[PDB]
Each structure stands twice: as structure tokens, then as C-alpha cells.
Write an enzyme that holds these catalytic residues in place. Structure first.
Site, PDB file in Angstrom:
ATOM      1  N   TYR A 224     -12.635   9.237   0.876  1.00  0.00           N
ATOM      2  CA  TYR A 224     -13.895   8.917   1.584  1.00  0.00           C
ATOM      3  C   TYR A 224     -13.662   9.214   3.067  1.00  0.00           C
ATOM      4  O   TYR A 224     -12.519   9.134   3.572  1.00  0.00           O
ATOM      5  CB  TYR A 224     -14.394   7.502   1.300  1.00  0.00           C
ATOM      6  CG  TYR A 224     -13.622   6.392   1.962  1.00  0.00           C
ATOM      7  CD1 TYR A 224     -12.497   5.831   1.352  1.00  0.00           C
ATOM      8  CD2 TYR A 224     -14.029   5.875   3.184  1.00  0.00           C
ATOM      9  CE1 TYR A 224     -11.784   4.804   1.956  1.00  0.00           C
ATOM     10  CE2 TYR A 224     -13.333   4.848   3.803  1.00  0.00           C
ATOM     11  CZ  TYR A 224     -12.212   4.308   3.184  1.00  0.00           C
ATOM     12  OH  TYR A 224     -11.532   3.286   3.784  1.00  0.00           O
TER      13      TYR A 224
ATOM     14  N   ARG B 247       0.852  -1.212   0.000  1.00  0.00           N
ATOM     15  CA  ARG B 247       0.000   0.000   0.000  1.00  0.00           C
ATOM     16  C   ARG B 247       0.880   1.252   0.000  1.00  0.00           C
ATOM     17  O   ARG B 247       0.452   2.248  -0.617  1.00  0.00           O
ATOM     18  CB  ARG B 247      -1.024  -0.090   1.135  1.00  0.00           C
ATOM     19  CG  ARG B 247      -1.897  -1.333   1.008  1.00  0.00           C
ATOM     20  CD  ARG B 247      -3.201  -1.221   1.748  1.00  0.00           C
ATOM     21  NE  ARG B 247      -2.989  -0.856   3.138  1.00  0.00           N
ATOM     22  CZ  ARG B 247      -2.636  -1.686   4.108  1.00  0.00           C
ATOM     23  NH1 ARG B 247      -2.396  -2.957   3.845  1.00  0.00           N
ATOM     24  NH2 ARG B 247      -2.507  -1.230   5.342  1.00  0.00           N
TER      25      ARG B 247
ATOM     26  N   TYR C  39       0.217   4.451  -2.079  1.00  0.00           N
ATOM     27  CA  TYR C  39       0.050   5.784  -1.430  1.00  0.00           C
ATOM     28  C   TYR C  39       1.068   6.778  -2.000  1.00  0.00           C
ATOM     29  O   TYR C  39       0.641   7.910  -2.297  1.00  0.00           O
ATOM     30  CB  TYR C  39       0.143   5.734   0.091  1.00  0.00           C
ATOM     31  CG  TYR C  39      -0.772   4.735   0.749  1.00  0.00           C
ATOM     32  CD1 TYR C  39      -1.995   4.381   0.195  1.00  0.00           C
ATOM     33  CD2 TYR C  39      -0.398   4.154   1.947  1.00  0.00           C
ATOM     34  CE1 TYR C  39      -2.804   3.442   0.810  1.00  0.00           C
ATOM     35  CE2 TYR C  39      -1.209   3.246   2.593  1.00  0.00           C
ATOM     36  CZ  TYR C  39      -2.406   2.871   2.012  1.00  0.00           C
ATOM     37  OH  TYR C  39      -3.161   1.957   2.690  1.00  0.00           O
TER      38      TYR C  39
HETATM   39  N1  LIG Z   1     -18.451   2.034   6.670  1.00  0.00           N
HETATM   40  C1  LIG Z   1     -17.568   1.915   7.650  1.00  0.00           C
HETATM   41  N2  LIG Z   1     -17.976   1.477   8.862  1.00  0.00           N
HETATM   42  C2  LIG Z   1     -17.063   1.333   9.832  1.00  0.00           C
HETATM   43  N3  LIG Z   1     -15.756   1.587   9.800  1.00  0.00           N
HETATM   44  C3  LIG Z   1     -15.387   2.020   8.583  1.00  0.00           C
HETATM   45  C4  LIG Z   1     -16.207   2.208   7.490  1.00  0.00           C
HETATM   46  N4  LIG Z   1     -15.480   2.655   6.402  1.00  0.00           N
HETATM   47  C5  LIG Z   1     -14.247   2.706   6.842  1.00  0.00           C
HETATM   48  N5  LIG Z   1     -14.124   2.352   8.163  1.00  0.00           N
HETATM   49  C6  LIG Z   1     -12.903   2.252   8.960  1.00  0.00           C
HETATM   50  O1  LIG Z   1     -11.854   2.925   8.297  1.00  0.00           O
HETATM   51  C7  LIG Z   1     -10.795   1.987   8.013  1.00  0.00           C
HETATM   52  C8  LIG Z   1     -10.079   2.422   6.763  1.00  0.00           C
HETATM   53  S1  LIG Z   1      -9.052   3.857   7.085  1.00  0.00           S
HETATM   54  C9  LIG Z   1      -9.953   5.206   6.294  1.00  0.00           C
HETATM   55  C10 LIG Z   1     -10.840   5.959   7.301  1.00  0.00           C
HETATM   56  C11 LIG Z   1     -11.601   7.131   6.680  1.00  0.00           C
HETATM   57  N6  LIG Z   1     -10.662   8.190   6.188  1.00  0.00           N
HETATM   58  C12 LIG Z   1     -12.556   7.726   7.718  1.00  0.00           C
HETATM   59  O2  LIG Z   1     -12.764   8.932   7.732  1.00  0.00           O
HETATM   60  O3  LIG Z   1     -13.132   7.023   8.556  1.00  0.00           O
HETATM   61  C13 LIG Z   1     -11.507   0.642   7.950  1.00  0.00           C
HETATM   62  O4  LIG Z   1     -10.629  -0.464   8.128  1.00  0.00           O
HETATM   63  C14 LIG Z   1     -12.451   0.798   9.143  1.00  0.00           C
HETATM   64  O5  LIG Z   1     -11.769   0.556  10.354  1.00  0.00           O
END
Ligand SMILES: Nc1ncnc2c1ncn2[C@@H]1O[C@H](CSCC[C@H](N)C(=O)O)[C@@H](O)[C@H]1O
Ligand SMILES: Nc1ncnc2c1ncn2[C@@H]1O[C@H](CSCC[C@H](N)C(=O)O)[C@@H](O)[C@H]1O
Lengths: 369, 12, 369, 12
Positions: free
Chosen positions: A91, A65, A69
């Protein structure tokens, strides 16, 4: 100097969790780079700007990754160096468990380009909303699952625990058909050691689509060893581990300061029932009958013109750029403003704007110097 | 259907 | 049963940090109750709904905040009991250091009414963006300043520390001309004990207005005793205390798992300079020249019709309510959809929608069962 | 100009 990088967020749930400023910055961008999960969010973004690149295509099976990145981060920085206003889109919150955003901004900043992150709604933001908890009560520890294990990060049994990336313990790479998460048991061992077999663990997945429900499935630490259960954990799984006990209040600190609230945290074990309508609650509510706004309360007293312009500054980054470069010039040119409104804009400071928009009591004003 | 969009890694 | 409560957030910065779903829920509400700080946000909200009540008027000088919070919470719940769809609005994230939102939802839920919190952009979300840090690296402890002191909550010198409400240590009440924060020194003592006199403390205030800059002023723990400095702390002040040291990695946990990243945390003391373009970075970037999307990468391949309807579901809570009540009924009625699009809507699940919106490789599909 | 909109308190 020409060229800038602005990184924005989409939030977690499809389209609707994007902020207004995120959307307007996407529209205004010369070049957009996005990394989102769901394709409605992606399609939405493509309607807002011609020049988009999907960063998701720089992932691959067996590809580390860090490589992905670095590549994402470089694609953005390169268009910054061509003098372009570049918008990156990630996201959730673009800075919460995101390497390439921090990476691209630090590079952009270290070469003297305008470099800004706009915050967004994180998965932890969603967790708090969906599981009905407040970080403040009784505090919050937030860790990446593997960093938690590798640096043996301290837990508090008296505060909230949030664990990101529980679906990829020890995994430095990527696969389009996910992973087994074979080291999951290692985390489950650390949790049992710190909390115990019977202690609750909430499997949290925020709904990604407007119509879907969150996953808010409670398990025991020991239940996480059952193959059927462990296999439900994936790349978008977050764990919430509630406190094991309320922490005694400190006698010494209460003195120096000269000294449960409803509702109870429902995920907490052996949680006592808390009363909503205690006397002080009943007395507070009785007061509503005769309640008048206090003297120092300052009602909104503004105009369509001032409302419209303060909205434009928030929603139209071109309107904002004029204003930022010459307050007085900008104010002079806004039509249908009262002198008091024009003056507030010329000064820019929160007090002046509050005096122009609110009917300030003679009291508050008095304070002054 | 196994979504995996991890945008951070830790020392390893 | 008739009546619902939805609590939404506006974010911190005026208007622009409100999510699209927050805005649409405000428009659709029968009755809106808001607690915001700046009057442009307030004026904006009033343009979106006829029936708004400012909850800020239930604060007062010498009036205990629990009284105010019970009163706010009751005003919302009462309109829920009349069968109305009530929207509560709180600045930032409506569930982050907010009693009356959790309170009103738990009451609404315990009496069998639809009760939902939508997440928003918190002050901590802003802190991460503005100070350029990531909770993941090296972890995050978040506390209310007084709870931190009163229950002697543990710090970690190896992880981020965020302290909310540093401007009202020990203060249970409210005043329209702020407070002295006389117990501030008590916090400053706890910080020196845990971190030491020379340790950095960042005074963080997120810009409230689009044109303003954040406050990101670093001080020593000892500097916080200077009257001129202490007096700059107020009701919207948050402290960020960076780590004192990197924590050694654990030998035993590295084995079981079968095993600095740029950029450095700039607020950390004696922080070493980290190189952006190491070999693996240079090699990652060289690959961009010949890069093609991998085979299992799935490009967007959707229609205006499906894009429009997936946007509507996110942005039009009426469109969503139809869909939620009968997937097949709703899908049948959407015009200009391909059978594959209609089918995806009828099923509702993320995979089907991804297959309809993305050009899925023969590979990913294969996985199947 | 001293904004104070605190929407939580702790045991006291
Ligand atoms: N729909 C969801 N529900 C719960 N945890 C989530 C999620 N989507 C992402 N995550 C969390 O985010 C991690 C990726 S890291 C990216 C996080 C993102 N930037 C944020 O703002 O949350 C996943 O492994 C999980 O732990
Ligand atoms: N503009 C701002 N900058 C920094 N911290 C802020 C802030 N506005 C509010 N806060 C923090 O929030 C505390 C009030 S509690 C309300 C927090 C709000 N719900 C949120 O989402 O952040 C303040 O004492 C301060 O610690």
C-alpha cells in the site's frame, strides 16, 4: 537470466490511487504478493491476477515485525529463483517506510535477477494534498517517530516536520487489536522541548475509502497528554508539525545570486494573511486579454497511430519489451505511422519523439548541436 | 477499528 | 454552490504514472487545464476530455514565472466562477514544488467553491524507487536548491538530502532553450562547506518515457565544478546527497523506551556490507514450513457484487456522488448485494465494510466497544 | 533536449 521482481504500490485511498503501470504489472505477473489495508483494494487486485498471496498473514500477536518482513521478502525471492516474473504489491509507495520491498529487491539484485521498484502515492503525498502544503516552501524534514527519538534527529522550526508511525513508539512487534502506545508521552516530551506546549501538531489520517474524509485535527503539543486525545493516535496516524517562524533571508547569498508567496501555510501559528491579487498579479492577469502562444511554444501535432503506440508502450509491458529489445524492428511493424513517427521510435530519444508529436518552431530546432 | 499495518521497524 | 476545482497529477513517467482517480476525474471534468512535459501524456489527456487548455503556453523567454503561475491559476479559477467543474492537471504530484495549484485552490476555497487536490507520484517518489532508498532510514530533508541557499537551511549529515531545481539556481524566469545556471558554483560551494569535496552527490533524472533508463550518476561535490559535468544538470535534474555517517543511538531515550538493517544504502560512502541472512532471518524463514494464518487473521470473503460496487465508488465519481449524498438510498439500489453488504454501505465506516468483505475471527469482534 | 518546466519559484 530467467526470473524478475517488480514491487509496485496501490497508493493510500482504496483502488483509485493505484497508478496505471502498477495495475498493468499486476495483470502481467506470474505470481503476485500483496500487503494492503482495505479489502476493496485486495478484492480489486484478485480480479487482476489468478496467482496472488496475501502477505498480511505473516504478521501475528507478539511476533517481531523483522520476522514478518524477512518472511514476506523470502516468499517473493523464492518464486524469483524458480525463474518466475514476481510482482510484490505494498500500500502507498512500496519503498516509503517499507523494509521487505528494499530487502527482496537487494537480494534479487545481488543474485543477478531483474529487480525494479515502481513508485506510488505515499501517505506524505496525501498529507501535502489534504493539508494543502508544499514541501519546497519552507522545506521538509521526514522521520519515523521512534528513529527521531532514538538518534535524537535534528528538527528545524523553519521547515515542515512529518512524523510517520507516531502510533507505535518503541514497539518492535504487532497486534491485531492494535497497541496502547504507552511511550507516546516520550515523543510529546521531545516535541515540547523543540517547539513548546502551545505549538500546533496536526493529527493526519488520509481517508482510506473514496467516500470518507481525511482527519486533519490540529492539537497543541500539551493537548497530546490528554488521554482522550492520545487514544485517537493509531497505526495509520501521521503527525505534521508546521514551522514556528519564517527564517530571515541571507544577505551574502542574495548578492552572489544578483537578486510571502500566496497562499499562506494555514497550519502555521500567527500566520499573516497573504494577498492573492497584488499589482504584479493584476498586471499578469491583464496580459491574458491579448495573450498569444509565444513563437517558441510547440503545439501538439500528432496522430491517433502515434498516440495509440506511445500509450501501448506505457500500459502494455509486452509491447514495451519488444520495443526495448529492437527499436527499429518494433517501429517498422507499428501500422499507420508516418516516416517521421517511425524514425522517432527507431531513435527512442525524447527530442525525436517531441519533434514527431509537436509542431516545433523554426528557432528551437536551430539551437541543435 | 484500529488498523495496524506497519511495514518497517528501526534499530530495536 | 455550483463550480469546483480538482487538481490532479500525471506522475513523472509518461501516462503510466497517472493514478486511476486522476484519469476518471479528467474524464468527468467540464474543463481541463494541463501542464505536462512529454507529448504522449498530453495526447493521452486529450483523448480523455474534449475541453482541454495547455497551460505550458503561458510560459515565455524572459517572462517571470510568478506571472505565468498567476495566469495559470486565474484561467482555472475563472471557469470555476462560471459554475463549471474544473480539473487542473500538473506533472508528478500537483502540490509538490507547484505554486499555481495551491494558488488556484486557496482562491477557489476563499470564495466558497469545492476545492480538492488529489496526490500523485512526485520526482522524490521516483528518486526513492530508482536509487533504492527509504526516507525513514535514516530520515529525509527535502529543499528547493535556491531556498536552501537563500535561507541557509540546515543540512543533516546523518539523514538523506534531496535538492529540487538544482538546474536553475537564482533564476526567476523561463527560456525555451534552457539556461546556463551560472550560479550553480554557489550551490557547489555550500555543499563542500557542509559535506566536503570527496562527499558523494547523485545526479538524478527519472526516465520520462517507459523505455528509457533513469540517470543515477554519482559525482564528488568537487567534480560539480568541471564544466562537462555541470552542463549535464538541467531543469529536470534533482540531487540526492546521502548521509556522511550513521548517528550514535541515544542512551537516555533507549531506557525510557525499554529497549544496520539490510539492505545498506549503496550511495553512502565507506558503507559496510550488511548480511541479509543472519540467524533471526534464518529462524524467521525456517518458520515458513509450518506457518498457518494466525487465528485473528481475517481472509477476504466478499462477492463480485460488493467488489464491483466498491470499485465503482473508487473509479466512477458519479457513483461516488450519489453514495456520498445518501448512503442508505445508494445501498438499497445496488443489485445482487447480501443484507450484510447493503448494511456495510449504509453505515459507510471502514469496520462495517471490513466485516462484510472479510471473514472476521470471533476474537477481533469480541474487542467491540 | 533541455526540458525546463519549473512550476514554482522562491522569494526572488
Ligand atoms: N491513511 C493514512 N493516513 C496517514 N498516514 C498514513 C496512512 N496510512 C499509512 N500512514 C503512515 O504510514 C505509516 C506506516 S509505514 C507505510 C507507509 C506507506 N508505504 C506509504 O506510502 O505511505 C503509518 O504509521 C503512518 O505514519
Ligand atoms: N524526471 C525527473 N527526474 C528528476 N527530478 C525531476 C524530474 N522531473 C521533475 N523533477 C524535479 O522537479 C523540479 C520541478 S518542480 C515540479 C515537481 C513535480 N510537481 C513533482 O511531483 O516532482 C525539477 O527541477 C526537478 O528538481
Amino acid at each position: 537470466k530467467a526470473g524478475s521482481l517488480t514491487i509496485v504500490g496501490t497508493g493510500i485511498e482504496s483502488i483509485g490511487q493505484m497508478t496505471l503501470q502498477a495495475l498493468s504489472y499486476i495483470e502481467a505477473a506470474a505470481k503476485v504478493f500483496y500487503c494492503v489495508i482495505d479489502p476493496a483494494t485486495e478484492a480489486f487486485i484478485l480480479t487482476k491476477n489468478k496467482n496472488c498471496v496475501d502477505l498480511y498473514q505473516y504478521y501475528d500477536n507478539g511476533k517481531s515485525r523483522l520476522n514478518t518482513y524477512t518472511q514476506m521478502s523470502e516468499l517473493m525471492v523464492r518464486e524469483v529463483r524458480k525463474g518466475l516474473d514476481v510482482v510484490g504489491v505494498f500500500y502507498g509507495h512500496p519503498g516509503v517506510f517499507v523494509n521487505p520491498s528494499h530487502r527482496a529487491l537487494a537480494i534479487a539484485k545481488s543474485e543477478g535477477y531483474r529487480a525494479r521498484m515502481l513508485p506510488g502515492v505515499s501517505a506524505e503525498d496525501c498529507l501535502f494534498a489534504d493539508l494543502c502544503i508544499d514541501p519546497s516552501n519552507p522545506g521538509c524534514l521526514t522521520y519515523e517517530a521512534s528513529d527521531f527519538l532514538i538518534r535524537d534527529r535534528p528538527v528545524s522550526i523553519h521547515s515542515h516536520l512529518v512524523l510517520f508511525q507516531v502510533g507505535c513508539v518503541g514497539i518492535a512487534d504487532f497486534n491485531f487489536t492494535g497497541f496502547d502506545n504507552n511511550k507516546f508521552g516520550v515523543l510529546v516530551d521531545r516535541l515540547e522541548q523543540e517547539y513548546g506546549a502551545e505549538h500546533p501538531v496536526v493529527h493526519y489520517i488520509a481517508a482510506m475509502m473514496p467516500h470518507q474524509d481525511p482527519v486533519t485535527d490540529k492539537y497543541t503539543v500539551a493537548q497530546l497528554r490528554e488521554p482522550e486525545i492520545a487514544k485517537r493516535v493509531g497505526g495509520v496516524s501521521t503527525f505534521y508539525i508546521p514551522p514556528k517562524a519564517r527564517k530571515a533571508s541571507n544577505l551574502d547569498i542574495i548578492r552572489r545570486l544578483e537578486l510571502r508567496i500566496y497562499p499562506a501555510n494555514q497550519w502555521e501559528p500567527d500566520v499573516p494573511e497573504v494577498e492573492p491579487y497584488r499589482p504584479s498579479d493584476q498586471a499578469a492577469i491583464a496580459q491574458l486579454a491579448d495573450h498569444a502562444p509565444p513563437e517558441q511554444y510547440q503545439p501538439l501535432a500528432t496522430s491517433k497511430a502515434m498516440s495509440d503506440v506511445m500509450t501501448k508502450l506505457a500500459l502494455d509491458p509486452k509491447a514495451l519489451a519488444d520495443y526495448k529489445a529492437d527499436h527499429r524492428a518494433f517501429a517498422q511493424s507499428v501500422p499507420d505511422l508516418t516516416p517521421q513517427e517511425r524514425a522517432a521510435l527507431e531513435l527512442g530519444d525524447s527530442w525525436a519523439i517531441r519533434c514527431a508529436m509537436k509542431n516545433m518552431p523554426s528557432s528551437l530546432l536551430d539551437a541543435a548541436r | 477499528g484500529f488498523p495496524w499495518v506497519i511495514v518497517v521497524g528501526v534499530p530495536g
